[PDB]
Curated annotation (Swiss-Prot), chain A:
This is Cytoadherence linked asexual protein 3.1. It is found in: Host cell membrane; Host cytoplasm; Cytoplasmic vesicle, Secretory vesicle, Rhoptry. The chain holds residues 1248 to 1358 of 1417 of the full protein. It comes from Plasmodium falciparum (isolate NF54). The lineage of its organism: Eukaryota, Sar, Alveolata, Apicomplexa, Aconoidasida. Self-associates. Component of the RhopH complex. RhopH complex is at least composed of CLAG3.1/CLAG3.2, RhopH2 and RhopH3 with a 1:1:1 subunit stoichiometry. CLAG3.1/CLAG3.2 mediates subunit association through independent contacts with RhopH2 and RhopH3, which do not directly interact with one another. Interacts with RhopH2. Interacts with RhopH3. It comes from the Eukaryota. Participates in the formation of new permeability pathways in Plasmodium-infected erythrocytes enabling the uptake of nutrients from the blood plasma. The gene is CLAG3.1.
UniProtKB/Swiss-Prot annotation, chain C:
Participates in the formation of new permeability pathways in Plasmodium-infected erythrocytes enabling the uptake of nutrients from the blood plasma. Required for maintaining invasion capacity of merozoites. Required for the trophozoite to schizont developmental transition of the intracellular parasite. Disulfide bonds join C133-C207, C220-C229, C238-C248, C393-C588, C443-C504. The keyword Ion transport does not apply. GO terms for cellular component: cytoplasmic vesicle; host cell plasma membrane; membrane; rhoptry; symbiont-containing vacuole membrane. This is High molecular weight rhoptry protein 3. Its main location: host cell. The lineage of its organism: Eukaryota, Sar, Alveolata, Apicomplexa, Aconoidasida. Keywords: Cytoplasmic vesicle, Disulfide bond, Host cell membrane, Host membrane, Membrane, Phosphoprotein, Signal, Transmembrane, Transmembrane helix, Transport.
Length: 111, 522, 706
């Protein structure tokens, strides 16, 4: 990550750029900071995962602590600007393009 | 129409394959001389090495310390190559002399024939209703013997040829003689099942050209979903070609019934070569190294070699910086001609004297070296692949039922209680190669391979089940796979005897939830 | 050829009364009372009913097929309008509105009796006013019950909310001030566990939305802005039965609690017409409303009412405030649809490809899928396609430059595809014209070149990971969905551009889907060109089944009658030309940078064995129906290697020309609204609350938990 930041944004450095990289970040930090006021109002309590993540049963508490350690490095250090723009049209084969995680295992309901 | 008979010559008469095996066997027979633990010559027969294997097991059980068991576990894995090599050199010798593919494959049938029972289960069926319930593997003989009472706890028994010939005889009797000599080795069992399928339809594949045949080296070379579509051309399957879903779904919606069970071992193995192709990719991922399973196989060979050496030319892996990144090891090989990366002199030299000293990351770069090369129709990596443990260990990942170990054993009984009525007086006496394998040949074969009590030295279950219940305090079979505290022990426990893997292969294929009313691979 | 006199023939009403019977039963729950559209008063409700029902040919959806309601079978493959324009001479729109409202209200009374039909409303969300909460809010926590999977959820009431406002302290103090007032032990225990778990678990106060329902065209006709419009709506209701009777109760309740300053200005608000209570909380962008097509009624995550016809978007937020200001932004303005004739309104919508389904049912034959046994004999070679040869430079022309930034390449691709629509509208100004043949190839190829241009930039390590553009067609799809309503473009309010805009929006949806297919086995994202394609057909280009696997995948969409068949068959062939493109560009001209991607691409001679193989397999006796249905709805431009490359060599020379005008910013695409800084006046956010929380220090008594 950092070499990919050392190459590009730290290529040219002057005094004018140092103020320039600040407010370019700060407005995005205010933009990234504005997301939590947006998303949290539209949340619902009944998610099948958020009941499961915040469990306190020690048999469930240990199934997650192995999971996030094993599934740690499948995540990446990349921030996407296109994370919240969604495709309005849904092809049923193409319903995955809404989701936008790196590690997207298919979860299938068996009844 | 020429590529049926031509592709079989890679199975049967490839002189590059015969050159690579004799390279391996000369390495093996020089490595059996130079052992500090203690011998067949090159021109010995297959039945020598069978009688030589049980000598080593009679030599290895008695001199089993906990301190020398690296030298023991190699000299078991060495032999179960050398037994397969002297089995694999049976057609390559005969086709080089006789130049006939039929008579060459006859030399395999003339081995496994070895040209030369109803009272048991009636005692069992009364025994189940007196039970009817975990007390069947826990009979009074197992009250004496607990977790690790003696050296015999890891092996078959206390080093009897008469015990080890009973397992030789029973799998010969119940049609499972192919499995027991090879192990569940993902290549050697796959190779010799295709050859078992070669004589079974020698008029259909050959001299009439109606059904398309493939070598086993080619089916490994294809992509992940392309293997089953190649396998469906091998047998007489018919289905929709393009399947968006997984293989494990669209296979079931065709009603595959009255299938040859030689074809159902291969569908097992391609399902566990797929889940071996993932688990080398899923565990070797680092930064600037993102492999994918459907990647083109000349590029995985390109990308993996351009990863560990910064030159994309195929370098020696065992001397690069990346193989030494986990831990600093030393750099010894005597021929330091450019040395090519898939060299049998090289890859067997580190497996002998450095493979016990590898961590988990250094291990996987050996198997990823030999998962590529399999994907590129390299005979050198094919011959390399016989002495790796990793192709044996694919049946370890098979266990995914969360039920107890006794509930898998009741489903083994539940087959036999149906199989006891299904006797149509089809008598299996020798494991031929013209023959089929029925489901009764598989359920009775595994159960009599498990519960073999000789000299009151406990059976294969009563050493394994006691290792689970009173040794790891585990009730659920699926908990062997999660929690690396359990698993890194459990792949050391099984790897004493290859016949554990042969047991689990016979125990996984027979203890399905739904084996009672449906096929094996179904 | 008859002048329209209000009389209906037997054939049209059988189409017409069916077209209601689909739409009122479109939920499948039965006939629905909210589904009524007033045609006479509002034209936009009428033209929406023209588009999705009347102008297109009839078709029963899959979920309606099991429902089995009033007889669709004589009237399946027939459209109402094309019959109606053929029988009768073209009328003005106003006698049509009386004619269809007369039929509809009889259909409504036949299904609902003496219920007065009302127009389908336009929804407006209002959450918070002046950073206060307009309703009794909701408390959300990360606490979890052991009795229930669901978190702790405490919803306030009206009488509790008076105490919740009069607290000077923060939100944490407000719930503590609330705890004295509350009188139920089943509430007090429910509030105690929230306050007790404060330091360990989140507590946030979240308001509910109130939706302002109103007839849009009836109310907002005379008002200048939508911001001006709701004010003229609320003054009707406070002075005054409309279903906004809730809100004017809630205002007078809440302004009673906000005692002196906020009740007076609200009481002054009903007098002065200069006042605006309705003020934008967010910077508004296109579109203003989202117009809900009937598919959106079925989606459970949307959870739409039947009465939703237009909602003010999540991009566009309204908050009631006295003090704040209205910026200068043109999208506040009331935009009404032009009342246009039934003739021209169809041809601005009418697309030839969306009748692919009716060609397949009438004059198309279902193709049997390839059985694997028949697949064995139809192929001869099983050797693998392999070529590692280095490409000769002298046949190729360097049109590709990698120094151009990706966010600029989003801008150039939209600007270049605005010009192709600009040339197709104006040069073919001459009544049943379709989209031109070159379109849906130029929409897909040019989006495919920039989609690969991400993957080339991300592999070369040249793009910053701070702003990685994930899907570039997403910039294309959001742009051409709303390009006609967007200022600053030649396509602004251009009715000919609508069916060119909607087509390139849907065609660019299928572009990244080909390039990003997560495999069914491996669930990872990836930076490759062919790994997207290889996961789609479940085979590799080195494998000899790859020619069959592409076409046999298209047989899946073909036998369904799917319109997506033409769009995909453009896409997969275009991806193969891309792999020829960059591998010819990079191997000759960027020989260092070529080395990192040479494993991520296909050699073009390997692509040629595929493309020579596909074109032969399309002419085979099994697949003759595939080729003919494609050429009905597209031209065979994509089969040529050379005309496609010139369409790419045009775009990659377009960058070298239009690099002058790269300065224009990307028009924003996110669903999340752009922030407008409002005056801090909230419960936690008063100036009084800043000094009150400094007045009490952090007491050692409470941190001891006593």
């Amino acid at each position: 990550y950092f070499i990919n930041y050392a190459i590009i944004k730290l290529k040219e450095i002057t005094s004018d750029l140092l103020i320039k990289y600040e407010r370019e970040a700060y407005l995005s930090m205010k933009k990234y900071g504005y997301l939590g006021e947006v998303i949290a109002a539209r949340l619902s309590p009944k998610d099948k995962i958020m009941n499961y993540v915040h469990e306190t049963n020690e048999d469930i508490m240990s199934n997650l602590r192995r999971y996030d350690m094993e599934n740690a490095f499948k995540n990446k250090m990349s921030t996407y600007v296109d994370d919240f723009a969604f495709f309005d049209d849904c092809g049923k084969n193409e319903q995955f393009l809404n989701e936008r995680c790196d590690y997207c295992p298919v979860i299938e309901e068996v009844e | 129409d020429n590529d049926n008979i031509e592709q079989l010559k890679s199975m049967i008469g490839n002189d590059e394959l015969h050159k690579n095996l004799t390279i391996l066997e000369k390495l093996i027979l020089e490595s059996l001389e130079k052992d500090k633990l203690k011998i067949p010559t090159v021109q010995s027969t297959f039945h020598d090495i069978v009688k030589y294997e049980h000598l080593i097991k009679e030599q290895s059980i008695e001199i089993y310390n906990s301190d020398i068991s690296d030298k023991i576990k190699k000299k078991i894995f060495i032999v179960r190559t050398l037994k397969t090599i002297k089995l694999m050199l049976i057609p390559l010798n005969s086709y080089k002399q006789n130049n006939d593919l039929k008579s060459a494959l006859e030399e395999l049938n003339n081995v496994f024939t070895n040209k030369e029972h109803g009272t048991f289960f009636r005692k069992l069926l009364t025994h189940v209703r007196t039970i009817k319930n975990k007390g069947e593997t826990l009979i009074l003989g197992d009250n004496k013997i607990d977790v690790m009472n003696s050296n015999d706890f890891f092996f078959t028994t206390n080093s009897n040829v008469k015990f080890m010939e009973n397992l030789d005889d029973i799998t010969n009797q119940y049609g499972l003689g192919l499995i027991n000599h090879l192990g569940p080795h993902l290549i050697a069992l796959g190779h010799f099942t295709v050859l078992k399928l070669a004589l079974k339809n020698y008029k259909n594949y050959f001299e009439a050209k109606s059904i398309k045949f493939f070598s086993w080296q080619k089916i490994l070379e294809f992509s992940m979903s392309d293997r089953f579509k190649v396998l469906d051309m091998m047998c007489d399957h018919e289905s929709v070609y393009y399947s968006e879903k997984k293989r494990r779904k669209t296979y079931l919606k065709v009603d595959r019934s009255n299938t040859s069970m030689e074809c159902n071992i291969l569908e097992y193995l391609l399902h566990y070569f797929n889940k071996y192709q993932l688990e080398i990719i899923k565990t070797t991922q680092d930064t600037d190294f993102d492999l994918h399973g459907m990647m083109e196989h000349k590029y995985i060979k390109d990308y993996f070699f351009s990863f560990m050496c910064n030159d994309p030319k195929e370098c020696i892996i065992y001397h690069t910086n990346q193989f030494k990144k986990e831990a600093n090891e030393e750099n010894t090989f005597p021929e330091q001609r450019q040395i090519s990366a898939f060299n049998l002199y090289l890859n067997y030299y580190y497996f002998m004297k450095r493979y016990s000293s590898y961590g988990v990351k250094k291990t996987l770069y050996v198997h990823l070296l030999n998962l590529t090369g399999l994907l590129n129709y390299d005979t050198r990596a094919y011959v390399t692949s016989l002495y790796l443990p990793g192709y044996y260990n694919a049946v370890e990942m098979s266990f995914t039922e969360e039920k107890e170990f006794s509930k898998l054993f009741e489903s083994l009984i539940q087959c036999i209680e149906k199989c006891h009525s299904d006797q149509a007086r089809q008598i299996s006496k020798d494991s031929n190669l013209l023959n089929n394998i029925t489901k009764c040949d598989l359920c009775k074969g595994a159960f009599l391979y498990a519960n073999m009590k000789f000299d009151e030295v406990p059976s294969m279950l009563q050493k394994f089940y006691v290792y689970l219940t009173k040794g790891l305090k585990i009730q659920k079979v699926s908990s062997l796979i999660k929690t690396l505290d359990i698993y890194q022990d459990y792949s050391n426990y099984l790897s004493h005897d290859i016949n554990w893997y042969t047991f689990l292969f016979l125990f996984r294929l027979t203890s399905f939830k739904e084996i009672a009313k449906k096929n094996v691979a179904e | 050829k008859d002048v329209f006199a209000g009389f209906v023939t037997k054939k049209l009403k059988t189409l017409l009364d069916c077209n209601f019977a689909l739409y009122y039963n479109f939920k499948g729950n039965g006939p629905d009372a909210g589904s009524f559209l007033d045609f006479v008063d509002e034209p936009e409700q009428f033209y929406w009913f023209v588009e999705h029902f009347l102008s297109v040919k009839f078709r029963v959806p899959k979920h309606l097929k099991d429902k089995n309601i009033h007889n669709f079978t004589p009237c399946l493959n027939r459209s109402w309008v094309s019959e109606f324009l053929k029988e009768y001479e073209e009328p003005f729109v106003n006698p049509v509105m009386k004619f269809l409202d007369k039929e509809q209200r009889l259909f409504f009374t036949y299904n609902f009796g003496d219920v007065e039909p009302q127009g389908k409303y336009t929804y407006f969300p209002v959450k918070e006013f002046h950073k206060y909460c307009i309703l009794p809010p909701l408390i959300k926590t990360n606490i979890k019950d052991g009795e229930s999977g669901e978190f702790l959820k405490y919803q306030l009431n009206k009488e509790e909310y008076k105490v919740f406002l009069s607290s000077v302290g923060s939100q944490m103090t407000a719930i503590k001030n609330l705890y004295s007032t509350v009188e139920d032990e089943q509430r007090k225990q429910l509030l105690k566990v929230i306050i007790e778990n404060e330091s360990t678990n989140d507590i946030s106060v979240q308001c509910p939305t109130y939706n302002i329902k109103l007839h849009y065209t009836k109310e907002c006709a005379n008002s200048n802005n939508i911001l001006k419009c709701i004010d003229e709506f609320l003054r009707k209701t406070c002075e005054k039965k409309h279903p906004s009777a809730d809100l004017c109760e809630h205002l007078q309740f809440l302004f009673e609690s906000l005692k002196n300053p906020y009740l007076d200005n609200f009481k002054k608000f009903m007098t002065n017409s200069d006042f605006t209570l309705i003020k934008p909380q967010s910077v508004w962008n296109v579109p203003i409303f989202d117009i809900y097509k009937p598919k959106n009624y079925l989606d459970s995550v949307q959870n739409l009412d039947t009465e939703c016809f237009k909602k003010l978007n999540s991009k566009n937020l309204i908050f009631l405030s006295f003090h704040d200001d209205i910026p200068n932004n043109p999208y506040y303005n009331v935009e009404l649809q032009e009342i246009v004739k039934l003739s021209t309104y169809t041809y601005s919508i009418f697309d030839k490809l969306y009748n692919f389904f009716f060609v397949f049912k009438k004059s198309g034959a279902p193709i049997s899928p390839v059985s694997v046994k028949e697949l064995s004999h139809n192929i001869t070679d099983f050797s693998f396609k392999e070529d590692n040869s280095e490409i000769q430079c002298q046949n190729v022309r360097k049109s590709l430059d990698l120094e151009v930034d990706v966010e600029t390449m989003k801008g150039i691709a939209a600007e270049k595809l605005c010009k192709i629509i600009e040339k197709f509208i104006l040069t073919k100004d001459d009544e049943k014209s379709d989209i031109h043949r070159g379109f849906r190839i130029l929409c897909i190829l040019i989006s495919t070149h920039v989609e690969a241009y991400n993957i080339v930039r991300q592999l070369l390590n040249m793009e910053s990971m701070i702003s990685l553009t994930r899907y570039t067609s997403l910039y294309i799809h959001k742009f051409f969905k709303s390009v006609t309503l967007l200022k600053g473009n030649f396509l602004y309010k251009n009715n000919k551009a609508i069916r060119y805009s909607r087509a390139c929006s849907k065609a660019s949806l299928h572009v990244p889907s080909v390039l990003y297919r997560r495999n069914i086995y491996i669930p990872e994202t990836f930076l490759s060109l062919y790994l997207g394609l290889s996961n789609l057909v479940s085979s590799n280009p080195s494998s000899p089944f790859f020619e069959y696997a592409i076409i046999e995948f298209l047989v899946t969409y073909y036998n369904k009658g799917s319109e997506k068949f033409v769009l995909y068959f453009i896409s997969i062939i275009s991806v193969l030309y891309i792999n020829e493109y960059y591998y010819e560009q990079l191997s000759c001209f960027y020989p260092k940078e070529f080395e990192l991607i040479k494993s991520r691409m296909i050699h073009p001679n390997i692509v040629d064995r595929i493309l020579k193989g596909i074109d032969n397999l399309m002419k085979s006796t099994r697949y003759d129906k595939m080729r003919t249905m494609y050429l009905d709805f597209e031209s065979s431009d994509i089969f040529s290697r050379e005309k496609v490359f010139t369409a790419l060599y045009n775009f990659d020379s377009f960058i070298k020309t239009n690099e002058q005008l790269k300065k224009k910013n990307l028009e924003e695409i996110s669903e999340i609204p752009v922030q407008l800084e409002t005056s801090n006046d909230g419960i936690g956010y008063r100036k009084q609350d800043v000094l009150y929380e400094t007045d009490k220090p952090q007491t050692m008594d409470e941190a001891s938990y006593e």
